[PDB]
Amino acid sequence: VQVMRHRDDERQKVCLDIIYKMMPKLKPVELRELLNPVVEFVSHPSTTCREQMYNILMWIHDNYRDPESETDNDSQEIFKLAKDVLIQGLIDENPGLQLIIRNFWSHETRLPSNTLDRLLALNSLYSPKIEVHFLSLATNFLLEMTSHSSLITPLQAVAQRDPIIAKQLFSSLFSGILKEMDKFKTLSEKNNITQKLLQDFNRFLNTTFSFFPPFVSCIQDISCQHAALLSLDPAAVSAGCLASLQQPVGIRLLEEALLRDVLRWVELAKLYRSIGEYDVLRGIFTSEIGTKQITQSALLAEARSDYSEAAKQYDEALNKQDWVDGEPTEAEKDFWELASLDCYNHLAEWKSLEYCSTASIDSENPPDLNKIWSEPFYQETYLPYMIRSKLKLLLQGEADQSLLTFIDKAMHGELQKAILELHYSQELSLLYLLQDDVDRAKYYIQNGIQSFMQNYSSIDVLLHQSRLTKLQSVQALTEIQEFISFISKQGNLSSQVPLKRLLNTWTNRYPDAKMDPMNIWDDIITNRCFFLSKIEEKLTDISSLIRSCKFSMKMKMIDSARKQNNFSLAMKLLKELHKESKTRDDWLV
Amino acid sequence: PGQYDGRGKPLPEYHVRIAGFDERVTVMASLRRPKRIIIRGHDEREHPFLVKGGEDLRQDQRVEQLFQVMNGILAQDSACSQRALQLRTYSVVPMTSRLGLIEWLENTVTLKDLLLNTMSQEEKAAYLSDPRAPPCEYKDWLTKMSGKHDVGAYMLMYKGANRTETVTSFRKRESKVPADLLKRAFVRMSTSPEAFLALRSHFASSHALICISHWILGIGDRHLNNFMVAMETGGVIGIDFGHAFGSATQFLPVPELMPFRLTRQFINLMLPMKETGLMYSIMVH
């Protein structure tokens, strides 16, 4: 077994040759040992060796079938571990070999050939090792049993070319068969067939990992054309369209589900929470997530810019005592807390946000660890406000000693790394500039720019305000980019003119009022004055000058808060600025 | 003309000097029968126009300038400048008395045309010509609860009918029309559920904004052919003005007290949301 894993080709050919020769005498208890070095060769060149690897499995499937023999777990586990690789051998970089394997699969009594039990077995061999081509392979298998005909084989040849026409072709073909199966297979068998179909589709959505947008959209489209498949899974459809960038097919699926029932609306709220459309958001918690007399009296102060009274009637709404008139059901105890978090975040709640985000899952003190990582409800919603409130509290100047060590223990592993580097990376690059690993922070801002391309690619052409919400952040991204590209240049600190140029292009180039809300405003304002303090730390009348540009930035912020009706945020900003406006005279007036 | 709108120093060097007329006129099969011509520009483009004669068009220019100052305020603020709320004004030029020209749009359809040919062969026929047609059932019920066979029976209607009797007879014709006829119109043509929703949101925002600004200067007589739905980008715009201020309920014999039209169809399009989240938010904003 050791020499089989070495680095020469003819040795690896002849060992598979003798293993094929010694096949129908070896015992199945050690075959589970034997077969695991065999299927380590699919990442190897040289079609001879891979050809023999798929030569032996063509019999290990064909006569270790175990026809309900009930012999072992290994003897009917090798069947699964062989079916896995004999499925994955349909995507190799060698045609003709695919002709061999598909001549095996298309052979008699390998997939049944009436018309549609064909397709029912075709759902079985999905295996999310492959999903990218399954629609094309499936329509090839479907139109194989065809034998005024000159168009169908170029149609099958163009089918394997773009994902869009393959998606359309599968959604046409399956719906056509399922519409026209009604010459037989009566209602009990109809209900049974749709039972197995819905089971297979739930299996699909729970198996797939690297989400592929035409496939996700294909199944969620073909679900909404027959009278059974509607109640698919209102818990994982939404979680697929949170990070598949495929919202407005799942929205239409949930509306067709709600027509003709609480978790449906909760996931619909989570679905519409990302594509804007806040009017239908607020028009949900006055319909089903409600039937109290504090929900309306908070939503009618949340529809305008009155984001203090609706906050102050949410803690009263949740730590109430008696309330014997009807209790808060399974719909709104979550939402009162979550909307309390969001209406905190809408204004400058950077002290009492960490508390309400992480102080609902555990004991008194913050034990913050895998507890906030496990049960990913605690990781999808409570976590982003936690990390946001964290660093937007840290950046003004404290020590606070938690987030440093928290990300230090976080960035170790698979699923504690492939989220904290997949998603955010900007605030992480910022706290890495705090931790002075700017080259790591350079890699992180690089992946952030790449991530913006990755998001903004698959957002559709006409779904407006989603594009705008994704689009506004790039001024902050190039702001930290120009800070990095400024500070690596040496000739700044021994002079004054590039500092004056940076001050002038900062005081010139702005965001505008009445078109950018105060969250992105607060992003760029705190980011830029933090950089002002950072370069003040680096050069260790420009204190008065940096105070001047600081005060102009926050005064522009004040007037924008006045223009977009946020009287409370500008109120608390001027009250923080009141002693700050005791320094000068013109700033006072 | 139609230029010289004020608002800066005017310059005739790039204005459209006329250079050519079409070899075509097109009639509108209506009561007043306007005609339509396809005039040409020296700046290498076309401009179509509609001719209506015999009508004093010296008030519609005034209300269009009112619409201009209205949606000049509507983009002055912040919270409506987010969601980009705008009225689509257009230009009618007052040639003389009893002669003016209508600026014309492209591939628009009337609201009643959309609701008619959206329907299939059956329900369109049942809405137009039925023995139990909701026009014909309504006039038959008018002869039921009055006794007469002419106008004045409507004036008799309120002294010979209670509330709930009319409520049930109103359901007896509200049941005679399918609910999501407007959504059947949007599903007839959108051919993508990616685009369907950004079509529907645009329709809703348009109709809500023109209904909240058809009340401040209150205008009655909003029947079906005062709504030009544009299929090109999902927008409805309004034409054919009857009465300027609150005047359609005083001097008319059978008055009307609805501030605008929000009937069954604008309800059932927004299903399965109640009419409480979107139209409400736009109107209150």
The answer to whether the CB atoms of B197 and A460 lie below 8 A apart is no
According to the 3-state scheme, what is the secondary structure of A507-567?
HHCCCCCCCCCHHHHHHHHHHHHHHHHHHHHHCCCHHHHHHHHHHHHHHHHHHHHHHCCCH
Provide the residue type at B94 as one letter. P
Resolution of this structure in Å: 4.3
In a 3-state reduction of DSSP, which class is residue B279? helix
Q: How far apart are CA A344 and CA A351, in angstroms?
A: 10
Please measure the distance between the N-terminal and C-terminal CA atoms of chain B and give it in whole angstroms. Answer: 36
Q: CA-to-CA distance for A1 and A49, rounded, in angstroms?
A: 16
In 3D space, the residue among B79, B208, B279, B73 whose CA is nearest the CA of residue A306 turns out to be B79
Burial class (CB in 10 A: 0-12, 13-18, 19+), A216: buried
Residue B261 CB neighbour total at 10 angstroms: 16
Question: How far is it, in rounded angstroms, from Cα A149 to Cα B126?
Answer: 44
Rounded to a whole number of angstroms, the CA Rg of chain A reads: 31
For B75, nearest residue in chain A (alpha carbons): A514
Give the torsion through C-alpha atoms of A4, A6, A9, A11, to 10 deg. Answer: -50
Q: How many whole angstroms separate alpha carbon B140 and alpha carbon B142?
A: 5
| Sign of CA pseudo-dihedral B195, B198, B200, B206 | negative
Q: Does A291 touch chain B (CB under 8 A)?
A: no
Strand ranges across the sheet with B108-110: B108-110, B228-230, B235-237
Q: With contacts defined as CB-CB under 8 Å, which chain A residues touch B77?
A: 514
Structure tokens at A161: 């070319």
Whether A335 and A285 have beta carbons less than 8 Å apart is answered as yes
Name the token pair of A394: 């840290």
B165's tokens: 């009797």
How far apart (Å, rounded) are the C-alpha atoms in residues B210 and B217? 11
- Three-state SS sequence of B10-64: CCCCCCCCEEECCCCCEECCCCCCCEEECCEECCCCECCEEEEECCCCCCHHHHH
Q: Which residues contact A217 (CB under 8 A, 6 or more apart)?
A: A167, A246, A249
Asked whether A385 and A353 are in contact (CB, 8 A), the reply is yes
What value does the CA radius of gyration of chain B take, rounded to a whole number of Å? 22
Asked if B284 reaches chain A (Cβ–Cβ under 8 Å), the answer is: yes
Q: How many CB pairs under 8 A join A and B?
A: 65
Contact yes or no for B194 and A248 at CB 8 A: yes
Q: How many CB atoms lie within 10 A of CB A139?
A: 21
> How far is A277 from A469, CA to CA, in rounded Å?
12
**Residue B124, CB half-sphere, CA atoms under 13 Å: how many?**
12
DSSP state of B252: S
Q: Which residues of A touch B281 (CB under 8 A)?
A: 278-279, 282-283, 303
Looking at chain B, how many residues does it have? 285
Chain A CB within 8 Å of residue B75 CB: no
Residue B18: φ, ψ to 5°? -70, 145
Angle separating helix axes A78-88 and A47-60, nearest 10 degrees? 140
Token pair, residue A495, equals 């002079």
Residues 239-258 of B with CB under 8 A from A: none
Q: Does residue B282 belong to the interface with chain A, where contact is any CB pair within 8 Å?
A: yes
Alpha-carbon gap, residue B51 to A541, rounded angstroms? 71
Instruction: Give the residue on A whose Cα is nearest the Cα of B79.
Output: A564
Give strand ranges (E) for B209-250.
228-230, 235-237
Per-position DSSP letters for A304-329, written without gaps between them: TT-TTHHHHTTHHHHS-S--TTS---
Q: Is the CB of residue A507 less than 8 Å away from at least one CB of chain B?
A: no
Q: Does A71 touch chain B (CB under 8 A)?
A: no
Q: Which residues contact A587 (CB under 8 A, 6 or more apart)?
A: A551, A580, A581
Which of A33, A144, A54 has the alpha carbon at shortest distance from A98?
Answer: A54
The helix (run of H) or strand (run of E) holding residue A344 is helix A333-345
- Measured distance between the N- and C-terminal CA atoms of chain A, rounded to whole angstroms: 85
Q: Which experimental approach was used here?
A: cryo-EM
What is the token pair recorded at B201?
A: 């949101």
List, in order, residues 6 or more apart from A351 with CB less than 8 Å away: A393
Q: Among A33, A42, A28, which residue's Cα sits nearest to residue A2?
A: A33
- DSSP 3-state of A348: coil
Q: Which of A279, A289, A518, A521 to mutate to test the interface with B (most CBs of B within 10 A)?
A: A279
Separation of CA B97 from chain center: 26
Picking from B60, B101, B117, B48, the residue whose alpha carbon sits closest to that of residue B238 is: B60
From the list A252, A287, A303, the residue facing B274 with the nearest CB is A287
The HSE-up count of residue A485 (CA atoms within 13 Å, CB side) is: 9
Q: How far apart are CA B1 and CA A175, in angstroms?
A: 57
CB contact under 8 A, B81 and A252: no
Distance from CA of B196 to the nearest CA of A (A): 9
> In angstroms, rounded to a whole number, what is the distance separating the alpha carbons of residues A446 and A440?
10
What residues contact B266, with CB distance under 8 A and at least 6 apart? B182, B207, B275, B279
- Give me the residues of A, 235-254, that contact B with CB < 8 A: 248-249, 251-252
- Which residue, among B110, B112, B116, B117, has the nearest Cα to B237 in the 3D structure? B110
Q: What is the DSSP annotation of A421-462? A: IIII-HHHHHHHHHTT-HHHHHHHHHHHHHHHHHHHHHS-SS
Is beta strand B99-103 parallel, antiparallel or unpaired with respect to B92-96? Answer: antiparallel
Residue A77 gets which letter from DSSP? T
Using the Cα atoms of residue A579, residue A581, residue A585 and residue A589 in order, give the sign of their dihedral.
negative
Residues of B in contact with A248 (CB under 8 A): 193-194, 196-197
Q: Is B271's CB within 8 Å of A259's CB? A: yes
For chain B, say whether A284 makes contact (Cβ under 8 Å). Answer: yes
Q: How does DSSP classify residue A403?
A: H
Q: Which residues of A touch B78 (CB under 8 A)?
A: 513-514, 563-565
